[PDB]
Design a protein around this ligand. Structure first.
Ligand code: BBE
Ligand code: BBE
Ligand code: BBE
Ligand code: BBE
Ligand code: CL
Ligand code: CL
Ligand code: CL
Ligand code: CL
Lengths: 293, 293, 293, 293
């Protein structure tokens, strides 16, 4: 069965004000491209072409101006609004008609991933047609996240949302793969004491039915989020160091679409034209004649 | 005589696309606050309260949403549009009625300044009620700028806009103080070979009449570059290092207004309220009870 | 057959003076640990325990003070001097008696690697008991390196040392695996026009005999070198971002030895003792009770 | 009267191990030059030519190899050892015969200063031929330092070394100017509860006699932190940003000596020769023909 994608690029409330007073966090650049390019590229790398972008009423037209309907990149993008930030699990109610009877994947609009064989890590989660798949990653500050606990055999046995005393240093990352049960689970969720529909409650529902796969995302992968001004800056520096070293870009959607064969050489050449006088368009042009393994 | 301020926050064309596709460069954050806070703070530090913000037609309402009429900060802000990026000198034609018969100051919306006694450096330019004052700063790449040449006595003798063979390494920074002659000079400007109304032509008009003061902005000042992705990132890191070392902010307009006595303690306390859950509001609150020299 | 390691941590001449006037480049820290810890950790990750450190006459005792005989980490370290910087291929002549009749691996003392399944990438090169194995990596500036050219089938067909017009963007990284033929090949090398015994000439000798394996090190790996002051700084920032995100260290030799089972819990506890009041010793202590996948 | 300088470049214990296992912190580079160049340049900027460098027994010959007797730079450098890190005030006992009956200045070997008119700020402290002068700087973490308390009139009224409950956010920086009384005061000091001869006790002695001038080092100056790996890295980035923006170096001793007229053009040209193949020597060469204001 095919899998649809959702990017949640909602309000980060007032947390990063005044930097985010004028625009949405997920429109801020990480080095050389808007933040949302990164999770969008993540969905694309998982082979997902039909994608719903959920944002605030105010910023939706700005996402639309940036991304269009996706057709330029071999995608089909649709848009939905989240009037109020009522929790990550709300994506499934807002996205209910978009999803229909299909499999799905949710990615947070401010999550960046980097590493070798990421494509294959995503592929193996995408091919699991039943149940749910999340990724666990070792962090310094697991108390900020959904935390997964494992028994001595390596099996996930509990999930806790922002525990004061984390059972491990393994956080659940902001990338989630779901079967056709997720909308019904989300519909039956009640708000938590913070007034939010919690994704962790969704994941625990799968866990209790023995249908949650927790794959380790190893330390050789970088999972960056952009939760503070400091971490945003570090994410920019990280991407810049890689791109300036390699002469290759991270999360260039045009490149990914070209490599997935969703667009061809002539379409890529046309996409390069408007940006030909800057490094980004020069990069797209170089992609036409260079072999990159 | 009073001096009015103008902030030119216009289009950077396609140079930083796709990062700047969604929103204007001068609304992007530098570390923890929108870029435009920095030149705005520069004008305020010069004692300027009546300020015209010029931007593109698309982004004007976003500057308006962010900054309002200024009254919350003891300022009087007005707004105007630049339909096409036809040169920095265009600010004086767009801003003609705003300026009237008063003295003026122009700052570029993407210029950041830092250093000791910057207040005094601006004060001494502001008090010159005749002629014009600009600042020259030693840079590695003077070709990118208006370049000033000095004779052996230290007197400015020529200005060249983006010369292929710069006469010195001294660039004219994006901060300009003018008397009542600037509008009339701007009205008589003809477009350059690049189709732009050049500020450098304005400055050369004053130079030929012996009325251009070119002050050296010494190497102990930081005039930070935001022209490239790399330089944007370096500026964010520079500001973060200073703020995290000192526990004091650079270019916090609320603080500057409070210290200029344009707003009082009770007004500052009210401004802190909406942001009380984050570091920026906590900073404003701390300013009410701490003596800072 | 067993494989011995060599780390070349020689003079970088005057290239980074005055920063390197007082000490060797490979003793400078990258974030929180001396540079040489990184390539040392790379050899360890490849399963190599018997390692020759080649440095200048002046700095050998400083490497010795830092690293000792290796016994604290389950290694056996020996030391050799390189009086004059006569080329990377000289490591095999200086290291001839150390190597004996064994397989070998050479790593440059200023090369840093990071990425997922690096262990497995190294393992597959280490298990090739005949011929030579190098890694090719896409860089922005291949003209600074040994460059490998591939035919349409992906087969390596030429190697060029620092070509003005590189045949590809694939540089040979500073990690090299060799069979028992390398010493004899090195002995027959004549100095190049720059007066150096070139590693690229060694690699081309294997290529001509059909015994060079060129494995791609993919873009999901970070290969950093520290060839300039700028790149050194970027390498520090890169490592710090990863370690501060994960609460896990890159190239902690004590950790690697513990995970390879070369030292046990009680030995690791003793190594933690001297450093117990700083973050590094606290990290080693935490490793005793935490499960990390 | 003439004023002699002392640079205290002693042990940082184990705090930054293993990075500092091999070599002293003050020999590590900050961006492009050894750390000690920065405080050395600070003394030079204050017009001080006769300078005692105090370090550990192990690292003294390395400071000597780097700096020599100073004669190449128009300085007269001498050397002395601190066997154990028994407090900053120990500098005056070790340095007693060097100081003699002259005025003095102490700078810590890991303190970096930057800002406009720093020369003048140092000059005005240097010209005070009686009493002592220190500088107070607003910091986020005053507990780490000597902390100065001021009454409502702005007068310094107490000094506390590393108070658990700081009376202000004003730290005393690691630059101190003293009259002929300091040696005798240092001789009468008793160790504190931490077993250290405290500079803060020296400064309090002057305070009680009404002879401590506490000048504010304003927020437009950078007093950069090198106490942690993170802060070391931030300092390197800060210096790189300034130097790469300006094409001018911070704390180039050859430049400062040339500008003070302590060495002439021909001597500077000779100093450039050995480094002519790298940016540092190219910079010195450029200084011979460029006017820099
Ligand atoms: C953030 C992000 C989004 C999408 C992919 C990746 S990645 O797998 O770590 N990575 C560096 C990457 C790639 N590996 N690739 C190559 C690639 C593209 C399509 C399919 C398989 C490989 C790419 O075109 N762009 C990339 O950013 C990172
Ligand atoms: C970019 C910029 C904008 C406004 C001020 C400055 S500044 O003078 O270099 N600077 C660090 C600074 C200050 N010096 N001050 C203190 C100050 C406030 C009002 C008048 C004179 C000084 C402040 O309140 N905010 C500041 O950002 C830099
Ligand atoms: C620079 C470097 C040196 C050695 C390993 C590595 S690495 O494979 O990219 N990496 C992050 C890494 C690890 N993967 N590991 C875990 C590990 C240790 C030993 C065997 C297999 C795995 C580790 O203990 N330290 C590491 O630095 C990087
Ligand atoms: C750390 C430090 C050490 C010495 C000077 C300085 S500085 O005054 O802030 N500074 C940027 C600086 C300078 N201002 N100058 C110019 C200068 C040289 C001699 C006397 C007065 C000024 C210089 O030649 N080198 C410098 O590093 C900072
Ligand atoms: Cl890869
Ligand atoms: Cl200056
Ligand atoms: Cl891994
Ligand atoms: Cl100041």
């Amino acid at each position: 069965m095919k899998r649809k994608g959702i990017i949640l690029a909602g309000g980060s409330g007032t947390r990063l004000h005044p930097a985010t007073l004028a625009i949405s966090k997920q429109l801020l650049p990480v080095y050389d491209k808007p933040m949302i390019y990164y999770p969008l590229s993540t969905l694309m790398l998982a082979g997902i072409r039909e994608i719903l972008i959920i944002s605030t009423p105010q910023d939706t037209p700005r996402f639309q101006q940036l991304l269009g309907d996706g057709s330029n990149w071999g995608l089909d993008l649709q848009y939905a609004v989240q009037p109020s930030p009522d929790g990550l699990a709300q994506a499934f109610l807002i996205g209910e008609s978009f999803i229909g009877n299909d499999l799905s994947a949710l990615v947070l609009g401010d999550n960046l991933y980097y590493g070798h064989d990421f494509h294959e890590l995503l592929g193996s989660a995408s091919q699991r047609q039943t149940g749910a798949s999340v990724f666990a990653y070792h962090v310094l500050d697991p108390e900020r996240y959904g935390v997964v606990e494992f028994d001595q055999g390596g099996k996930a046995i509990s999930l806790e949302e922002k525990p004061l005393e984390p059972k491990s240093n393994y956080a659940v990352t902001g990338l989630y793969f779901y079967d056709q049960q997720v909308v019904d689970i989300a519909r039956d969720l009640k708000p938590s004491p913070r007034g939010e529909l919690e994704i962790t409650d969704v994941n625990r529902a799968y866990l209790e039915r023995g249908q949650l796969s927790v794959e380790i995302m190893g330390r050789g992968y970088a999972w960056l989020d952009t939760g503070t001004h400091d971490s945003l800056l570090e994410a920019g520096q990280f991407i810049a160091t890689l791109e300036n070293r390699q002469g290759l870009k991270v999360a260039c959607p045009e490149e990914i679409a070209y490599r997935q064969k969703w667009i061809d050489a002539a379409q890529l050449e046309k996409l390069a034209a408007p940006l030909a006088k800057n490094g980004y368009g020069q990069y797209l042009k170089r992609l036409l004649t260079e072999t990159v393994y």
